[PDB]
Amino acid sequence: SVSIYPSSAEVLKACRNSNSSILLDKCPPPRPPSSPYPPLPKDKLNPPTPSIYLENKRDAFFPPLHQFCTNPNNPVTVIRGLAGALKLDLGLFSTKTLVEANNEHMVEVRTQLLQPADENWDPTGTKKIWHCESNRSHTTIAKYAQYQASSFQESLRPFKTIKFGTNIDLSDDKKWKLQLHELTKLPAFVRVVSAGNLLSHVGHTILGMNTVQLYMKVPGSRTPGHQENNNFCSVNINIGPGDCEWFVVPEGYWGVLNDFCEKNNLNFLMGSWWPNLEDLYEANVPVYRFIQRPGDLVWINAGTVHWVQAIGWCNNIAWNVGPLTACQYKLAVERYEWNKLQSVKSIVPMVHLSWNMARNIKVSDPKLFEMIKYCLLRTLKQCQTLREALIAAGKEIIWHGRTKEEPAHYCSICEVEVFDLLFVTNESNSRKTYIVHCQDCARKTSGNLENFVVLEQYKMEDLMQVYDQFTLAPP
Ligand SMILES: O=C(O)CCNc1cc(N2CCc3ccccc3CC2)nc(-c2ccccn2)n1
Ligand SMILES: [Cl-]
Ligand SMILES: [Mn+2]
Ligand SMILES: [Zn+2]
């Protein structure tokens, strides 16, 4: 076993400084990948869905299940019969039970057009378009449940308008104690919290990622195309009683879809679009398409592009997990860097997270370990390079510290993550609102930060110690 990274002292010494370099500061910039090679012929563009057929509770705790779902060659896995094999009480998530539990709870309503089959037409039924319009409003569980039940009775006897109940927050364990406890029966690799889940080492709540979200659906309710925040895997269980239809594109094709968006004058990361399948076929993009029944679990693998529509009436619950794998960490870092270049907020603060991983996790896989320690090295050097430059300009550094569960801070202007050294205007320091800016956004306002002090959250000696103690663990 060979260490390939310099000591924190060595990194420190090189920041104090025509010497030799320790590493190449210039990193190649992120960019969308080209269409995958080798290309796929027309006859391979509708592949079948990787499927797991559970019968016994023992079946669900079979270790090879974990490796099958995280395998990069499987963009999505449907786990059939999951709820029945664990004897999960999905009734705890039925609309009737939810109304009884918290009838005032908020629901974010998306009002959409009911579209036909797998297509997306402009409002006049004239042409098939990618942009799928929606309006955001808000209501209560009781009011949305009314509409959902009403809508089913209307069904029992040129586009109609439907309402999708989205982003229902199930994080509060004192409002949802029985619901959340039921999900502790799941095997570790799909649980909301676990030691092998990267999002469980964030140290604070990431709403909808390390907490459960619920969706309430009528037929036609659509989830537009997207990748997960920072390419984290997603877990989704259909409560029933109706089915959902899923559309999945492998991660490696996200650059192709990015280009379709640009050309269609749509934003890939932030827009709402429903892909035209004839467009994807034309470009030799394979599309996985399947039905998720009540009690089926859907595993969206890292970076997989997906979209969904309800076929019947149903609720879904969903959250993220981050497998402790090189593939997962690598894709989360790449999207983190791409988000910076696009001025898109990273919902997962990958720098904060990586340092927490280095504190908590004994990593035995060499490839994953090397990626993490490399991230520590670059950020440790970036911090000390800024710290030195501050001293060199005589601008002092207020010890601000932080609490154990204090979230990561983002820049008020550009929304990049700000680690260790925060820039706050004096009128924001004085009123202790501590409006955080990144270094760049502050200077665009004060050449030498006239209106700015800088707070320090970590002791450099603490960072240097975590870096030095992060070593490759034995198998
Ligand atoms: O339909 C399902 O069961 C899947 C729900 N998944 C959703 C659902 C969802 N919302 C509901 C669907 C919807 C409908 C219309 C407009 C926008 C949106 C996005 C918000 N957002 C996201 C999201 C957002 C950012 C990053 C990662 N994920 N995921
Ligand atoms: Cl655990
Ligand atoms: Mn999602
Ligand atoms: Zn900024």
Task: Indicate whether 267 and 361 sit together in one domain.
Answer: no
Q: Would you call 279 helix, strand, or coil by DSSP?
A: helix
Say yes or no: CB of residue 352 within 6 Å of ligand 1.
no
Consecutive H or E run containing 80: strand 76-80
Domain boundary among 278, 305, 325: 325
Q: Are residues 174 and 293 in the same domain?
A: yes
Through-space distance between the first and last CA atoms of the chain, rounded to whole angstroms: 12
- How far is ligand 4, taken at its centre, from the CA of residue 76, in Å? 35
**Are residues 252 and 104 located together in one domain of the fold?**
yes
Q: How many residues does the chain have?
A: 475
Question: Does residue 66 have its Cβ closer than 6 Å to ligand 1?
Answer: no
Question: With a 6 A CB cut-off, is 226 part of the ligand 1 pocket?
Answer: yes
The answer on 158 and 224 residing in a single domain is: yes
* Residue 314 annotated as part of some ligand binding site: no
Please tell me the number of the ligand nearest to residue 214's CA: 1
> Which of 282, 277, 314 shows the shortest CA–CA distance to 298?
314
**Boundary of a domain, candidates 272, 302, 325:** 325
Q: 38: cis peptide before it, omega within 30°?
A: yes
Q: Cβ distance 255 to 314 under 8 Å?
A: no
To test the pocket of ligand 1, the residue of 112, 130, 199, 223 to mutate (highest count of ligand atoms within 8 Å of its CB) is 223
Beta bridge pairs of residue 149: none
327 is in an annotated binding site: no
CA angle 463, 228, 352 (to 5 degrees): 10
Q: Whole domain around residue 288: which residue ranges?
A: 17-325
C-alpha closest to that of 274 among 321, 308, 240, 233: 308
Residues 332 and 465 in one domain: yes
Site to probe by mutation for ligand 1, drawn from 166, 168, 314 as the one with most ligand atoms within 8 Å of Cβ, is: 166
> Which distant-in-sequence residues (6+ apart) come within 8 Å of 300 by Cβ?
76, 228, 233, 234, 235, 236, 248, 306
Strand partners, 299: 77, 235
236 lines ligand 1 (CB under 6 A): yes
Note whether 213 and 109 are same-domain residues: yes
Is the distance from CB of 431 to CB of 360 less than 8 angstroms? no
Ligand 1 binding pocket includes 215 (Cβ within 6 Å): yes
Cis peptide before 474, with omega less than 30 degrees from 0?
A: no
Question: How many angstroms is it from 280 CA to the middle of ligand 2?
Answer: 40
Closest ligand to C-alpha of residue 200 is 2
The annotation status of 226 as a binding-site residue, yes or no, is yes
In short, whether 378's Cβ falls inside 6 Å of ligand 1 is no
Experimental technique behind these coordinates: X-ray
Q: Which atom of ligand 1 is nearest to the CA of 223?
A: 12
Residues 352 and 378 in one domain: yes
Ligand 4 centre and the CA of 349: distance in Å?
A: 15
- Residue 166 forms beta bridges with which residues? 108
**C-alpha distances in Å from residue 95, one per residue of 35, 108, 240, 292:** 43, 15, 10, 19
Nearest CA to ligand 1 atom 18: 223
Q: 71: Cβ–Cβ under 8 A, 6 or more apart, which residues?
A: 301
Q: Can you list the alpha helix ranges (DSSP code H) found in 241-299?
A: 254-263, 277-282
Do β-strands 76-80 and 297-300 pair in parallel, antiparallel, or remain unpaired?
antiparallel
- Same-domain status, 282 and 364: no
The closest ligand to the CA of 307 turns out to be: 1
Q: Whose CA is nearest to atom 27 of ligand 1?
A: 228
Closest CA to 102 of 63, 68, 142: 142
Are residues 107 and 4 both part of a single domain? no
Nearest residue (by CA) to ligand 1, atom 19, is 223
From the CA of 414, which ligand is nearest? 4
Nearest alpha-carbon partner for 65 in 77, 55, 56: 77
Indicate whether 376 and 419 sit together in one domain.
no
The domain total for the chain is 3
69 is in an annotated binding site: no
Q: Is 217 exposed, middle or buried (0-12, 13-18, 19+ CB in 10 A)?
A: buried
CATH number of the domain encompassing residue 145: 2.60.120.650
Flag whether 201 is marked binding. no
Please list the residues that pair with 234 across neighbouring strands: 300, 320
**Residues 209, 231: Cα–Cα separation, whole Å:** 11
Q: Do 336 and 426 fall into the same domain?
A: no
H or E stretch at 262: helix 254-263
Q: Is the CB of 228 under 6 A from ligand 1?
A: yes
- What CATH number is attached to the domain comprising 420? 2.10.110.20
Tokens 């990069």 belong to 72
Do the bridges between strand 76-80 and strand 51-53 make them parallel or antiparallel, or are there none, so unpaired? parallel
**Does residue 223's CB lie within 6 angstroms of at least one atom of ligand 1?**
yes
C-beta 272 within 6 A of ligand 1: yes
Query: Strand pairing of 314-321 and 233-241?
Result: antiparallel
| C-alpha–C-alpha distance, residues 79 and 152, integer Å | 28
What does the block give as tokens for 70?
């995280």
DSSP alpha helix (H) spans, 231-349: 254-263, 277-282, 326-342
State the DSSP code for 76: E
